[PDB]
Amino acid sequence: KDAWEIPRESLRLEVKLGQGCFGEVWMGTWNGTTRVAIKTLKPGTMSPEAFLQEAQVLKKLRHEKLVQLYAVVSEEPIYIVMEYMSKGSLLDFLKGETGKYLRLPQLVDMAAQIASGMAYVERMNYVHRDLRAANILVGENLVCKVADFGLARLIEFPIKWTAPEAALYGRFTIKSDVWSFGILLTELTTKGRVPYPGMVNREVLDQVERGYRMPCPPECPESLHDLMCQCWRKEPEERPTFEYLQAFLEDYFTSTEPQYQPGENL
Ligand SMILES: COc1cc(Nc2c(C#N)cnc3cc(OCCCN4CCN(C)CC4)c(OC)cc23)c(Cl)cc1Cl
């Protein structure tokens, strides 16, 4: 046991937020004062330090644009205790009521924050393995954080967000996260629309290997789709860094699209 462990008696499992093939997610209260969120094991569901190795990644990672670990439980019943994100998933946020008021400036800045989280990941020498809008939590003031490193690792599988070399040959790198970041960029600019519309997994895998790439989403600037294309380069090592992507997006509206005017959607 380590210093990340707490008494479970500390924990008010209150409202329910979701389920899965893993367990649940709950709003709750920690030591009576603190709002938290808990990813649960409903008793047996799966392996101990499989559920509890997303902790071992999340313990050593610690950035403002990453969802924060608060504590863990193995005094079974079992829990992963984390920082509570008020507006839920970026996917739900984009599809929901506020989604449609979202404009490029907002969307680019969300992209930015995420780039920022991932750039930290990048210099910590970790890989996320599952980057996509569904694993981005939104809080107040349009804040976005990376969450659910649930497969993550030191650099020692829903394929539409997955880089070819990673889906096919299991080559997961920060460079394959980048690939996913570019796909994540199509989600933001379409307001949550599933990538590769009308295509099934195997068809996506076959067309992407022949070099098919998603075209510029409607009302999305060419400069922003260029960036997605860079993120989707065949050779992993030619994809840009999260550091370049972070700085590119923060500076976007001055350095890159300094003449942008809003349309009916973006
Ligand atoms: C702890 O373990 C993990 C937990 C999570 N999941 C969450 C964490 C975290 N972290 C924090 N806070 C969350 C808040 C949620 O909903 C709150 C508000 C929802 N509404 C949207 C619609 N409007 C109009 C009302 C508000 C939520 O919904 C499912 C999931 C959350 C992930 Cl993604 C990964 C890991 Cl590893």
Torsion, Cα of 230, 232, 238, 239 (10° steps): 70
**Same structural domain, 170 and 195:** yes
Measured from the CB, is residue 17 less than 6 Å from ligand 1?
A: yes
Measured from the CB, is residue 147 less than 6 Å from ligand 1?
A: yes
Q: How many of the other CB atoms lie within 10 Å of CB of 16?
A: 11
226-232 own/partner pairs: CB under 8 Å, 24+ apart: 227/182, 227/185, 228/182, 228/183, 228/185, 228/186, 229/182, 230/182, 231/178, 231/179, 231/181, 231/182, 231/183, 231/185, 232/179, 232/182, 232/183
Which tokens is 77 given?
Answer: 């019943």
Q: CA 228, CA 220: separation in Å to the nearest integer?
A: 11
Beta strands in 31-92 (DSSP E): 34-41, 69-72, 78-83
Measured from the CB, is residue 39 less than 6 Å from ligand 1?
A: yes
Q: CA 114, CA 104: separation in Å to the nearest integer?
A: 15
**Same structural domain, 165 and 247:** yes
How many domains are contained in the chain? 2
Q: What is the DSSP letter of 89?
A: B
Q: CA 197, CA 212: separation in Å to the nearest integer?
A: 13
Q: Determination method here?
A: X-ray
Which tokens is 3 given?
Answer: 């210093």
**Same structural domain, 71 and 90:** no
Beta bridge partners of 39: 25, 80
Question: How far from chain centre, in Å, is Cα 50?
Answer: 19
Distance 254 CA to ligand 1 centre (A): 33
Please tell me which residue in 2, 92, 109, 130 is annotated as part of the active site: 130
Q: If 0-12 CB within 10 Å is exposed, 13-18 middle and 19+ buried, where does residue 105 land? A: middle
Q: Could you tell me the CATH number of the domain that includes residue 192?
A: 1.10.510.10
Domain limits at 235? 85-259
Q: Could you tell me the CATH number of the domain that includes residue 65?
A: 3.30.200.20
Residue list, annotated binding site: 17-25, 39
Which tokens is 123 given?
Answer: 């210099």
**Same structural domain, 96 and 61:** no
- CA-nearest residue for atom 25, ligand 1, is 87
Resolution in A, one decimal? 2.6
Percentages (nearest 5) of helix, strand, coil residues in the chain: 40, 20, 40
Mutate which of 13, 70, 85 for ligand 1 pocket (most atoms within 8 A of beta carbon): 85
Q: If 0-12 CB within 10 Å is exposed, 13-18 middle and 19+ buried, where does residue 37 land? A: buried
What are the distances in angstroms from CA 6 to CA 14, 25, 71, 116? Answer: 18, 18, 6, 30
For 19, the 3-state DSSP assignment is: strand
Distance 24 CA to ligand 1 centre (A): 10
Is there a contact between 83 and 18 (Cβ–Cβ < 8 Å)?
no
Q: CA 122, CA 156: separation in Å to the nearest integer?
A: 14
**Same structural domain, 103 and 198:** yes
Measured from the CB, is residue 151 less than 6 Å from ligand 1?
A: no
Mutate which of 30, 39, 93 for ligand 1 pocket (most atoms within 8 A of beta carbon): 39
Q: CA 125, CA 21: separation in Å to the nearest integer?
A: 29
Q: CA 260, CA 266: separation in Å to the nearest integer?
A: 10
**Same structural domain, 168 and 239:** yes
Chain breaks in the chain following residues, C–N > 2.5 Å: 156
Beta strands in 68-135 (DSSP E): 69-72, 78-83, 126-127
Helices then strands, counting H and E runs in the chain, come out as: 9, 9
Distance 17 CA to ligand 1 centre (A): 7
What are the distances in angstroms from CA 92 to CA 80, 144, 177? Answer: 22, 13, 21
Cα 200-157-213 angle, rounded to 5 deg: 50
